[PDB]
């Protein structure tokens, strides 16, 4: 890797600088280099990794959706044939997105997940694995589409099983996992009832545990609970 010659601590410091400069591609490259040092990541380092790649892939997804919309409109009735360019460029963005997802999944498989023994780290990584298979599923059309969807579901389900055994219902990682798995059910698995049930049950069980929290933990938990309520409002 081009980051192989840079100190782990310097990669982490530069990822933080890249975040302040809103240079998310750089941030992701620095965090990939840090993961490839082979040591486990701390909680803050896991956040830097996730923020970097979520922003890179989020921009790719937004661009893909714009291009896919144009492509679908170009393929309707009465639409003037514009040639292969819209499809080619949507495919170009799609292949770039798939490459980023494969990179993240590769870091998780080699070897972040297998060394993650505490619930905070293991649930976070398994959630990321579900997330990046979900982004692959958003663009998938081939023989492997169902397997991609099932890979997302399986990673989310393992994360859920650990989170319910090992974390309180207000833990922000448990809440964020449930938020994203609920979105998976709604958008990917064509299971809106499962999406709604999961979001509502997660919200209600968190509400009943807020009394145990400090003011700062309360702020963290209620922030994610509001996202669950926002999605429930969109869907009901």
């Amino acid at each position: 890797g081009a980051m192989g010659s840079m100190e782990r601590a310097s990669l982490i410091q530069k990822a933080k600088l890249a975040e302040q400069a809103e240079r998310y591609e750089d941030m992701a490259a620095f965090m990939k280099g840090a993961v490839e040092k082979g040591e486990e990541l701390s909680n803050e380092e896991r956040c830097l990794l996730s923020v970097a790649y979520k922003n890179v892939v989020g921009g790719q997804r937004a661009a893909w959706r714009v291009l896919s919309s144009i492509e679908q409109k170009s393929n309707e009735e009465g639409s003037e044939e514009k040639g292969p360019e819209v499809r080619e460029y949507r495919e170009k963005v799609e292949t770039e997105l798939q490459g980023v997802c494969d990179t993240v999944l590769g870091l998780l498989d080699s070897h972040l997940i297998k060394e993650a023994g505490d619930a905070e780290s293991r649930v976070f990584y398994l959630k990321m694995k579900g997330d990046y298979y979900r982004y692959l599923a958003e663009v998938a059309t081939g023989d492997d589409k169902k397997r991609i969807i099932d890979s997302a579901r399986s990673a989310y389900q393992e994360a859920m099983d650990i989170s319910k055994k090992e974390m309180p219902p207000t833990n922000p990682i448990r809440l964020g996992l449930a938020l994203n798995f609920s979105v998976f059910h709604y958008e990917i698995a064509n299971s809106p009832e499962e999406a709604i049930s999961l979001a509502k049950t997660t919200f209600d069980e968190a509400m009943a545990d807020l009394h145990t929290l400090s003011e700062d933990s309360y702020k963290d938990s209620t922030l994610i609970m509001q996202l669950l309520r926002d999605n429930l409002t969109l869907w009901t």
Binding site: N180, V183, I224, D230, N231
Partner: peptide, 6 residues
Amino acid sequence: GFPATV
């Protein structure tokens, strides 16, 4: 459109 994810 994007429902919320984190």
